[PDB]
Amino acid sequence: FTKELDQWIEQLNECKQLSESQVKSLCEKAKEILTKESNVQEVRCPVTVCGDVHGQFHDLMELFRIGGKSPDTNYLFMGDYVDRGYYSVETVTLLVALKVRYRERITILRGNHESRQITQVYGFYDECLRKYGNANVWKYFTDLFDYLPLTALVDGQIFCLHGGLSPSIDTLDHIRALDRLQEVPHEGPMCDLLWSDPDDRGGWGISPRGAGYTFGQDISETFNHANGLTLVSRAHQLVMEGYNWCHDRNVVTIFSAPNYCYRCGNQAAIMELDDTLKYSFLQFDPAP
Amino acid sequence: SLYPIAVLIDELRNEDVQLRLNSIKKLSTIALALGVERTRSELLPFLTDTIYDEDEVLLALAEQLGTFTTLVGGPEYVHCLLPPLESLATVEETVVRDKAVESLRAISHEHSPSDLEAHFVPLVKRLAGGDWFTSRTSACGLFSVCYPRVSSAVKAELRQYFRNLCSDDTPMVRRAAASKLGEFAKVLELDNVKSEIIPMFSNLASDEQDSVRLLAVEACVNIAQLLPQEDLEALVMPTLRQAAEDKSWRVRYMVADKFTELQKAVGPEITKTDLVPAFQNLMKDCEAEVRAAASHKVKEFCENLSADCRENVIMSQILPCIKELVSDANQHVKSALASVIMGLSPILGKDNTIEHLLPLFLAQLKDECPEVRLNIISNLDCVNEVIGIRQLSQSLLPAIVELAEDAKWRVRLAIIEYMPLLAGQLGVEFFDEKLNSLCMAWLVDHVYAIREAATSNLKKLVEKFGKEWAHATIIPKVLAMSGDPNYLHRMTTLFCINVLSEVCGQDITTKHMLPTVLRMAGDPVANVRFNVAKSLQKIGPILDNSTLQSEVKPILEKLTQDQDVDVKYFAQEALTVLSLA
């Protein structure tokens, strides 16, 4: 079986999708593995933190050209593997395939797009149809996404998640207390963690997304202090410079899809947390 | 069919009297079976008309017949070989018509002067004055071998047929006559070259068909050499000056292509007078094919200018045109120039190069087209052996160091791939003092692809300076990274050891790299640990067996007990591959 996974990965690296058959297999095993993981998955450094990819497969390959090949380089992706991009199938399958082959080298979180309703509005669903002739590959993956850990704690100091903070969650314990094995709800803690955005208005605000909330610096400082965190590391938001600091550096956004939707013209970045939790950023443009 | 000839035939197929290929090559032997009389009376005749289209065969038959003079009776009978060759000459697939001719030319020398007149020339005519066309395309290649030896009267005859061949109604029988006019010219008396060749030449140069005109440029070189310098201006130059101006760029292209040959064939005086202006016009031609052809000849041309006017026409006529070309639009052209421009240094001197070329040298080292800066980088040996390594390092080094550290990786990756070149050219002493620093810095670059590039770049460097140079100049600094707090760097160390074992030899690997590798089997980070297993699997084959058993086997075995899944797996794999499992 291991020789197989290696081949599947060799294939996916040539941008060649796996078969409905194999995806079903890859997903069943990925579930097995992902169930044992926590809502606040412990991740020890060194490890490179990545933001949104959104099916931009060739930019993912650019990401590996810059941060190193797996499993040599450890990776933590904060979700949003599908939609918008042209290769949602190749992208998410390569990533899940890396996770099943190297549980300890790769960590994948759930983003607001690793869900059933949004994937039928922005790509993934239809791409699966154009490539497999039926919704099975989509059901195998959307079912799998229910097992994706909502957040990761690196060295018990750096809290990572796709979206952001929730007014109904003040401690890492509150998060561990949620049942993440379900579709993303339209309201609540689980929803907010995947939908909220840091803001430059104080306290809690109305999210322009129509889900989750906005939260100012004051809220971050409290969340950080109450949880012995040095930083909140998230994605979910297009950031022209690739990465962006805010809230007197209590929060950092990391977007990994250069030139989003193939029209934004933004750089992409990944964040390297070394053996000492010392951080450094790598900005990159779309691969030629 | 009958023996012994029947041995040639292939009774097993389904052809039309086809011959055995592996046999037509063993023809000199059947000729030896029956005697010389029977080789003539029955072997040749059988070969003459038994001409299927089995080409691999027709070819051999044509080649083989050019070494049959003696198996036929020697010179006195050499002409028995004509019939089958005449035939093979008019075939199809040119390859065969060619061999047919090569052989006919070979045996022409065997014919006696008297036999040339009696059998050979007559074969030349029938091919020339032949109906079909190939029969003529090939007649052209048979005039130069017989002309010198036949009678004054037949010489005349031969001249006439050659003429008729130049004015043939078919473009091909003309392109052919043209490409053989030069060699024919060389075997005529000066008189007839002036009175007969020149008119044919003139005519072909002004052919309605340009496919024929572009070929007369090559003929001009030959005719121009045969004639005394004073005759050139009247009998040739008008025609040549016209060619460089020709409506068809194809004809101009041939002029820029054969420029250096014309220079020699025409002489220094005319080169300064007529050719220097022609060259400038060609370098400014509207078609980029022509400009490029010309630019390519720049170094060879200036090299051949008369020592006395040389340096002057260069700084005054040639150099201003070159500054133009370094800015040309077509990379096809900037391309041709860059592959030879720096070859002008040893023809302008240290001072001139330093003041007038070094600037153009930089204008191209920073050109867009990759091929262009690469052409400049591949030819530093001459500029370097002219001006001083310091004066060069002073005009090249900032260009490099400025790119080795730049915005985009890729642009940096590009400079990494110049190193093995700069190394091999500028020398190991220059590299150890101005380049080794940069190659070490990249090993620790932020971008992985750059680190990777610089890692394999070391192997290319050891191939240039040797295993000793490595153990002294590079292994010490590479190993120093194992103490680095960042696991990305510590792994980089094992990656350099993997590549360097490929070219450092068993001694240097066992003594100076293996220890550092085994020492990291206890690295705090799992990624380094399993990559250690991998590194041992990689360099394991270079170590002698006693080492693999005393020092490697133990370390791997321990790694298989590791807490980490991947160190465990890769440890096992290493054992199994090295056969220590």
Ligand SMILES: C=C1[C@@H](O)[C@@H]2O[C@]3(CC[C@H](/C=C/[C@@H](C)[C@@H]4CC(C)=C[C@@]5(O[C@H](C[C@@](C)(O)C(=O)O)CC[C@H]5O)O4)O3)CC[C@H]2O[C@@H]1[C@@H](O)C[C@H](C)[C@H]1O[C@@]2(CC[C@H]1C)OCCC[C@H]2C
């Ligand atoms: C996705 C989004 C939001 O995230 C997006 O949030 C806003 C603010 C910032 C964002 C735009 C960002 C930029 C950078 C991109 C850039 C580009 C080039 C395109 C563009 O792309 C956006 C969609 C997407 C993907 O590419 C993105 O999120 O960037 C849509 C707007 C486009 O201009 O904006 O827009 C307002 C519009 C809003 O719409 C949709 C939103 O209705 C989706 C609803 C709210 C969801 O409800 C559901 C089901 C799934 C889905 C319908 O689950 C949440 C709970 C209720 C439930 C019904």
Ligand SMILES: [Mn+2]
């Ligand atoms: Mn998102």
Ligand SMILES: [Mn+2]
């Ligand atoms: Mn997103």
